[PDB]
Amino acid sequence: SAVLEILTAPDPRLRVQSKQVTDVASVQTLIDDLLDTLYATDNGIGLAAPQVGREEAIVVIDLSDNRDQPLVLINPKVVSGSNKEMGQEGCLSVPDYYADVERYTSVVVEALDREGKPLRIETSDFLAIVMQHEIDHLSGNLFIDYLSPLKQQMAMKKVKKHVKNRAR
Amino acid sequence: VLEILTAPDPRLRVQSKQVTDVASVQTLIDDLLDTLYATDNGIGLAAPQVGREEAIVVIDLSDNRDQPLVLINPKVVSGSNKEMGQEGCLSVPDYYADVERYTSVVVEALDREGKPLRIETSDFLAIVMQHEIDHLSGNLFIDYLSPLKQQMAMKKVKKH
Ligand SMILES: CCCCC[C@H](CC(=O)NO)C(=O)N[C@H](C(=O)N1CCC[C@H]1CO)C(C)C
Ligand SMILES: CCCCC[C@H](CC(=O)NO)C(=O)N[C@H](C(=O)N1CCC[C@H]1CO)C(C)C
Ligand code: NI
Ligand code: NI
């Protein structure tokens, strides 16, 4: 068990390549901690383990209004995608910066659910975008990596200020 | 398209002269814009960087490079909230280092037809204006760095 902190850029732990999970029983506590941490944010809808400094390939998502529809993805991978479009994204690890990012709008993701059983999600919903964002975190990528150098400097400046001025 | 000078070049250290006749510098403004838009990566350009002593700056922070900002006789009249931020410079190519700037500024200037302009900003534009305006008094951002860092800068420029 752990108290998890959401890390913010620039922090090299956000750039680590995640490790595949080979012992699903061993990550149940982390999954519940990740869910609690996501549910403690005002606005977050997903969270990836590298964002709390853990190297396991684990993502949690909850798109629901009441936050009672948790989705847990272990070892997720995009196995098909098509129909790229631009859409605004923000990130708990790049707080207070938002920009349009290109993603597939139809995707199939394969993973294990939290009990270790095979999971295959086929979606053209906003969930497709959210899964791609979270899966990017597992390869140490942030959405600002797709932007121009000027926009990346703009983002880092905004993050630094938001983090410095955050209230307790 | 004009040529951008690199340090060490005493023309980068010239104190710029105020512009009193806006019509006579209209050709230079378009020349500065063409020269900036011919760079791979630049977002602003000051007249001393093309060997001219007139107090003129051009800036474009847009993705498509279709929102030029032209500043004649620009002056920082207020600033607050100094912070460190990375800068690079077309006149110190391939050198990047953290430098202190105001993150909230008020700049007074004239637009390209001479009417008064007052820009109050806490955005990234604040940094770019300060960097460009520094060029007009013959300052490069490396002047604010330690001697060891300045020594390094000169080596990097030469290799470019
Ligand atoms: C949009 C694609 C990614 C969503 C996941 C992120 C959280 C995150 O960084 N996951 O790695 C999020 O909730 N981002 C929020 C976000 O961008 N949201 C919240 C839902 C709508 C959208 C507004 O841009 C911000 C406010 C932190
Ligand atoms: C950053 C504040 C001032 C920037 C202005 C300079 C140009 C300059 O030398 N003006 O006198 C620029 O475009 N610099 C570029 C720069 O540092 N950039 C380009 C946009 C983002 C940032 C780092 O990538 C380099 C690559 C030449
Ligand atoms: Ni994110
Ligand atoms: Ni410069």
Side-chain angles (χ1 to χ4, degrees), chain A residues 77-82 104-109 121-125 127-129 131-132 135:
Chain A
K77 160 170 172 37
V78 172
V79 307
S80 75
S82 60
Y104 300 115
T105 58
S106 291
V107 86
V108 177
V109 164
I121 301 168
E122 318 187 25
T123 178
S124 52
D125 183 63
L127 176 61
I129 309 303
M131 296 197 287
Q132 284 166 83
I135 292 168

PDB file of all heavy atoms in Angstrom, chain A residues 77-82 104-109 121-125 127-129 131-132 135:
ATOM      1  N   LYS A  77      -2.059  -2.389 -25.025  1.00  0.00           N
ATOM      2  CA  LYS A  77      -1.400  -2.200 -26.311  1.00  0.00           C
ATOM      3  C   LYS A  77      -2.454  -1.830 -27.347  1.00  0.00           C
ATOM      4  O   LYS A  77      -3.550  -2.391 -27.352  1.00  0.00           O
ATOM      5  CB  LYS A  77      -0.628  -3.481 -26.669  1.00  0.00           C
ATOM      6  CG  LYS A  77      -0.282  -3.676 -28.110  1.00  0.00           C
ATOM      7  CD  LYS A  77       0.675  -4.852 -28.286  1.00  0.00           C
ATOM      8  CE  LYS A  77       0.871  -5.161 -29.768  1.00  0.00           C
ATOM      9  NZ  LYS A  77       0.900  -3.950 -30.623  1.00  0.00           N
ATOM     10  N   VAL A  78      -2.131  -0.869 -28.213  1.00  0.00           N
ATOM     11  CA  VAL A  78      -2.999  -0.582 -29.359  1.00  0.00           C
ATOM     12  C   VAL A  78      -2.747  -1.645 -30.417  1.00  0.00           C
ATOM     13  O   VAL A  78      -1.642  -1.751 -30.955  1.00  0.00           O
ATOM     14  CB  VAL A  78      -2.743   0.822 -29.929  1.00  0.00           C
ATOM     15  CG1 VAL A  78      -3.524   1.028 -31.233  1.00  0.00           C
ATOM     16  CG2 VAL A  78      -3.128   1.896 -28.894  1.00  0.00           C
ATOM     17  N   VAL A  79      -3.773  -2.418 -30.753  1.00  0.00           N
ATOM     18  CA  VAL A  79      -3.576  -3.437 -31.771  1.00  0.00           C
ATOM     19  C   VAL A  79      -4.164  -3.018 -33.116  1.00  0.00           C
ATOM     20  O   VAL A  79      -3.771  -3.570 -34.153  1.00  0.00           O
ATOM     21  CB  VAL A  79      -4.132  -4.801 -31.308  1.00  0.00           C
ATOM     22  CG1 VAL A  79      -3.553  -5.138 -29.970  1.00  0.00           C
ATOM     23  CG2 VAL A  79      -5.622  -4.786 -31.262  1.00  0.00           C
ATOM     24  N   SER A  80      -5.068  -2.042 -33.141  1.00  0.00           N
ATOM     25  CA  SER A  80      -5.453  -1.453 -34.412  1.00  0.00           C
ATOM     26  C   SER A  80      -5.980  -0.056 -34.140  1.00  0.00           C
ATOM     27  O   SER A  80      -6.426   0.243 -33.027  1.00  0.00           O
ATOM     28  CB  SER A  80      -6.486  -2.293 -35.185  1.00  0.00           C
ATOM     29  OG  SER A  80      -7.779  -2.181 -34.619  1.00  0.00           O
ATOM     30  N   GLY A  81      -5.867   0.812 -35.139  1.00  0.00           N
ATOM     31  CA  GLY A  81      -6.400   2.155 -35.023  1.00  0.00           C
ATOM     32  C   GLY A  81      -6.529   2.785 -36.390  1.00  0.00           C
ATOM     33  O   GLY A  81      -5.738   2.497 -37.296  1.00  0.00           O
ATOM     34  N   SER A  82      -7.506   3.675 -36.534  1.00  0.00           N
ATOM     35  CA  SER A  82      -7.686   4.354 -37.815  1.00  0.00           C
ATOM     36  C   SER A  82      -8.381   5.690 -37.605  1.00  0.00           C
ATOM     37  O   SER A  82      -8.820   6.021 -36.500  1.00  0.00           O
ATOM     38  CB  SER A  82      -8.458   3.468 -38.801  1.00  0.00           C
ATOM     39  OG  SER A  82      -9.740   3.151 -38.280  1.00  0.00           O
ATOM     40  N   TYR A 104      -5.977   8.322 -33.189  1.00  0.00           N
ATOM     41  CA  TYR A 104      -6.980   7.535 -33.892  1.00  0.00           C
ATOM     42  C   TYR A 104      -8.328   7.718 -33.205  1.00  0.00           C
ATOM     43  O   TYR A 104      -8.412   7.694 -31.977  1.00  0.00           O
ATOM     44  CB  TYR A 104      -6.600   6.050 -33.897  1.00  0.00           C
ATOM     45  CG  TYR A 104      -5.285   5.767 -34.571  1.00  0.00           C
ATOM     46  CD1 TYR A 104      -4.195   5.268 -33.851  1.00  0.00           C
ATOM     47  CD2 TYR A 104      -5.126   5.998 -35.935  1.00  0.00           C
ATOM     48  CE1 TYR A 104      -2.985   5.017 -34.472  1.00  0.00           C
ATOM     49  CE2 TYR A 104      -3.920   5.745 -36.567  1.00  0.00           C
ATOM     50  CZ  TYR A 104      -2.854   5.263 -35.834  1.00  0.00           C
ATOM     51  OH  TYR A 104      -1.662   5.022 -36.481  1.00  0.00           O
ATOM     52  N   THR A 105      -9.398   7.868 -33.989  1.00  0.00           N
ATOM     53  CA  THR A 105     -10.711   7.934 -33.357  1.00  0.00           C
ATOM     54  C   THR A 105     -11.429   6.592 -33.307  1.00  0.00           C
ATOM     55  O   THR A 105     -12.474   6.508 -32.664  1.00  0.00           O
ATOM     56  CB  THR A 105     -11.603   8.964 -34.061  1.00  0.00           C
ATOM     57  OG1 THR A 105     -11.756   8.642 -35.451  1.00  0.00           O
ATOM     58  CG2 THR A 105     -10.970  10.339 -33.908  1.00  0.00           C
ATOM     59  N   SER A 106     -10.884   5.557 -33.940  1.00  0.00           N
ATOM     60  CA  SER A 106     -11.348   4.177 -33.807  1.00  0.00           C
ATOM     61  C   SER A 106     -10.130   3.370 -33.426  1.00  0.00           C
ATOM     62  O   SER A 106      -9.083   3.500 -34.060  1.00  0.00           O
ATOM     63  CB  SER A 106     -11.952   3.645 -35.112  1.00  0.00           C
ATOM     64  OG  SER A 106     -13.179   4.281 -35.408  1.00  0.00           O
ATOM     65  N   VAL A 107     -10.226   2.573 -32.373  1.00  0.00           N
ATOM     66  CA  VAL A 107      -9.058   1.868 -31.875  1.00  0.00           C
ATOM     67  C   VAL A 107      -9.516   0.525 -31.330  1.00  0.00           C
ATOM     68  O   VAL A 107     -10.677   0.358 -30.956  1.00  0.00           O
ATOM     69  CB  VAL A 107      -8.343   2.730 -30.804  1.00  0.00           C
ATOM     70  CG1 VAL A 107      -8.942   2.513 -29.390  1.00  0.00           C
ATOM     71  CG2 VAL A 107      -6.850   2.518 -30.838  1.00  0.00           C
ATOM     72  N   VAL A 108      -8.612  -0.453 -31.349  1.00  0.00           N
ATOM     73  CA  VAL A 108      -8.784  -1.685 -30.573  1.00  0.00           C
ATOM     74  C   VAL A 108      -7.588  -1.764 -29.640  1.00  0.00           C
ATOM     75  O   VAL A 108      -6.443  -1.618 -30.086  1.00  0.00           O
ATOM     76  CB  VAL A 108      -8.888  -2.952 -31.442  1.00  0.00           C
ATOM     77  CG1 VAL A 108      -8.999  -4.201 -30.529  1.00  0.00           C
ATOM     78  CG2 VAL A 108     -10.087  -2.888 -32.388  1.00  0.00           C
ATOM     79  N   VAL A 109      -7.849  -1.936 -28.340  1.00  0.00           N
ATOM     80  CA  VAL A 109      -6.800  -2.062 -27.335  1.00  0.00           C
ATOM     81  C   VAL A 109      -6.925  -3.451 -26.717  1.00  0.00           C
ATOM     82  O   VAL A 109      -8.036  -3.898 -26.418  1.00  0.00           O
ATOM     83  CB  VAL A 109      -6.899  -0.962 -26.257  1.00  0.00           C
ATOM     84  CG1 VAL A 109      -6.064  -1.313 -25.002  1.00  0.00           C
ATOM     85  CG2 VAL A 109      -6.436   0.397 -26.836  1.00  0.00           C
ATOM     86  N   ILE A 121     -10.851  -4.228 -26.054  1.00  0.00           N
ATOM     87  CA  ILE A 121     -11.819  -3.141 -26.134  1.00  0.00           C
ATOM     88  C   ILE A 121     -11.765  -2.549 -27.531  1.00  0.00           C
ATOM     89  O   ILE A 121     -10.692  -2.127 -27.982  1.00  0.00           O
ATOM     90  CB  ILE A 121     -11.540  -2.054 -25.090  1.00  0.00           C
ATOM     91  CG1 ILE A 121     -11.574  -2.646 -23.684  1.00  0.00           C
ATOM     92  CG2 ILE A 121     -12.537  -0.893 -25.252  1.00  0.00           C
ATOM     93  CD1 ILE A 121     -11.035  -1.700 -22.633  1.00  0.00           C
ATOM     94  N   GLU A 122     -12.911  -2.526 -28.213  1.00  0.00           N
ATOM     95  CA  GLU A 122     -13.037  -1.930 -29.548  1.00  0.00           C
ATOM     96  C   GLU A 122     -13.932  -0.712 -29.427  1.00  0.00           C
ATOM     97  O   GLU A 122     -15.080  -0.835 -28.997  1.00  0.00           O
ATOM     98  CB  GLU A 122     -13.602  -2.935 -30.547  1.00  0.00           C
ATOM     99  CG  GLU A 122     -12.976  -4.318 -30.355  1.00  0.00           C
ATOM    100  CD  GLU A 122     -13.365  -5.324 -31.421  1.00  0.00           C
ATOM    101  OE1 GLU A 122     -13.711  -4.908 -32.549  1.00  0.00           O
ATOM    102  OE2 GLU A 122     -13.316  -6.537 -31.111  1.00  0.00           O
ATOM    103  N   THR A 123     -13.410   0.467 -29.771  1.00  0.00           N
ATOM    104  CA  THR A 123     -14.199   1.646 -29.473  1.00  0.00           C
ATOM    105  C   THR A 123     -13.931   2.752 -30.490  1.00  0.00           C
ATOM    106  O   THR A 123     -12.807   2.911 -30.979  1.00  0.00           O
ATOM    107  CB  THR A 123     -13.937   2.148 -28.036  1.00  0.00           C
ATOM    108  OG1 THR A 123     -14.692   3.336 -27.783  1.00  0.00           O
ATOM    109  CG2 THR A 123     -12.453   2.412 -27.772  1.00  0.00           C
ATOM    110  N   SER A 124     -14.994   3.486 -30.806  1.00  0.00           N
ATOM    111  CA  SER A 124     -14.898   4.742 -31.541  1.00  0.00           C
ATOM    112  C   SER A 124     -15.366   5.892 -30.666  1.00  0.00           C
ATOM    113  O   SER A 124     -15.613   6.996 -31.161  1.00  0.00           O
ATOM    114  CB  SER A 124     -15.714   4.670 -32.833  1.00  0.00           C
ATOM    115  OG  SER A 124     -17.033   4.234 -32.559  1.00  0.00           O
ATOM    116  N   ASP A 125     -15.473   5.645 -29.361  1.00  0.00           N
ATOM    117  CA  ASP A 125     -15.921   6.618 -28.377  1.00  0.00           C
ATOM    118  C   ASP A 125     -14.742   7.496 -27.947  1.00  0.00           C
ATOM    119  O   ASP A 125     -13.590   7.281 -28.349  1.00  0.00           O
ATOM    120  CB  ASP A 125     -16.528   5.867 -27.185  1.00  0.00           C
ATOM    121  CG  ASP A 125     -17.093   6.783 -26.123  1.00  0.00           C
ATOM    122  OD1 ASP A 125     -18.052   7.518 -26.436  1.00  0.00           O
ATOM    123  OD2 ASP A 125     -16.578   6.758 -24.976  1.00  0.00           O
ATOM    124  N   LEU A 127     -13.412   7.247 -25.264  1.00  0.00           N
ATOM    125  CA  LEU A 127     -12.527   6.288 -24.603  1.00  0.00           C
ATOM    126  C   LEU A 127     -11.308   5.944 -25.451  1.00  0.00           C
ATOM    127  O   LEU A 127     -10.218   5.711 -24.914  1.00  0.00           O
ATOM    128  CB  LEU A 127     -13.313   5.011 -24.298  1.00  0.00           C
ATOM    129  CG  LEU A 127     -12.503   3.862 -23.688  1.00  0.00           C
ATOM    130  CD1 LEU A 127     -11.894   4.276 -22.355  1.00  0.00           C
ATOM    131  CD2 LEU A 127     -13.416   2.638 -23.518  1.00  0.00           C
ATOM    132  N   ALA A 128     -11.482   5.892 -26.776  1.00  0.00           N
ATOM    133  CA  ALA A 128     -10.362   5.621 -27.676  1.00  0.00           C
ATOM    134  C   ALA A 128      -9.241   6.630 -27.467  1.00  0.00           C
ATOM    135  O   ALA A 128      -8.065   6.257 -27.398  1.00  0.00           O
ATOM    136  CB  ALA A 128     -10.826   5.654 -29.132  1.00  0.00           C
ATOM    137  N   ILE A 129      -9.592   7.916 -27.367  1.00  0.00           N
ATOM    138  CA  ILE A 129      -8.589   8.965 -27.162  1.00  0.00           C
ATOM    139  C   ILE A 129      -7.926   8.806 -25.802  1.00  0.00           C
ATOM    140  O   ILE A 129      -6.696   8.900 -25.667  1.00  0.00           O
ATOM    141  CB  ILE A 129      -9.231  10.360 -27.289  1.00  0.00           C
ATOM    142  CG1 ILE A 129     -10.056  10.506 -28.578  1.00  0.00           C
ATOM    143  CG2 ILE A 129      -8.183  11.460 -27.039  1.00  0.00           C
ATOM    144  CD1 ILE A 129      -9.316  10.255 -29.860  1.00  0.00           C
ATOM    145  N   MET A 131      -7.619   6.136 -23.900  1.00  0.00           N
ATOM    146  CA  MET A 131      -6.697   5.006 -23.834  1.00  0.00           C
ATOM    147  C   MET A 131      -5.384   5.312 -24.538  1.00  0.00           C
ATOM    148  O   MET A 131      -4.323   4.923 -24.053  1.00  0.00           O
ATOM    149  CB  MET A 131      -7.338   3.741 -24.417  1.00  0.00           C
ATOM    150  CG  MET A 131      -8.565   3.279 -23.605  1.00  0.00           C
ATOM    151  SD  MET A 131      -8.962   1.567 -24.034  1.00  0.00           S
ATOM    152  CE  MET A 131      -9.638   1.949 -25.686  1.00  0.00           C
ATOM    153  N   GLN A 132      -5.421   6.010 -25.684  1.00  0.00           N
ATOM    154  CA  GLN A 132      -4.168   6.294 -26.378  1.00  0.00           C
ATOM    155  C   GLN A 132      -3.290   7.217 -25.546  1.00  0.00           C
ATOM    156  O   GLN A 132      -2.067   7.058 -25.506  1.00  0.00           O
ATOM    157  CB  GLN A 132      -4.441   6.905 -27.756  1.00  0.00           C
ATOM    158  CG  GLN A 132      -4.885   5.839 -28.744  1.00  0.00           C
ATOM    159  CD  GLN A 132      -5.468   6.478 -29.972  1.00  0.00           C
ATOM    160  OE1 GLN A 132      -4.743   6.871 -30.886  1.00  0.00           O
ATOM    161  NE2 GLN A 132      -6.785   6.676 -29.956  1.00  0.00           N
ATOM    162  N   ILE A 135      -1.821   5.044 -22.692  1.00  0.00           N
ATOM    163  CA  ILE A 135      -0.832   4.092 -23.196  1.00  0.00           C
ATOM    164  C   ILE A 135       0.449   4.819 -23.578  1.00  0.00           C
ATOM    165  O   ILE A 135       1.550   4.276 -23.421  1.00  0.00           O
ATOM    166  CB  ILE A 135      -1.431   3.273 -24.362  1.00  0.00           C
ATOM    167  CG1 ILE A 135      -2.550   2.352 -23.835  1.00  0.00           C
ATOM    168  CG2 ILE A 135      -0.340   2.472 -25.095  1.00  0.00           C
ATOM    169  CD1 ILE A 135      -3.387   1.736 -24.944  1.00  0.00           C
TER     170      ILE A 135
END
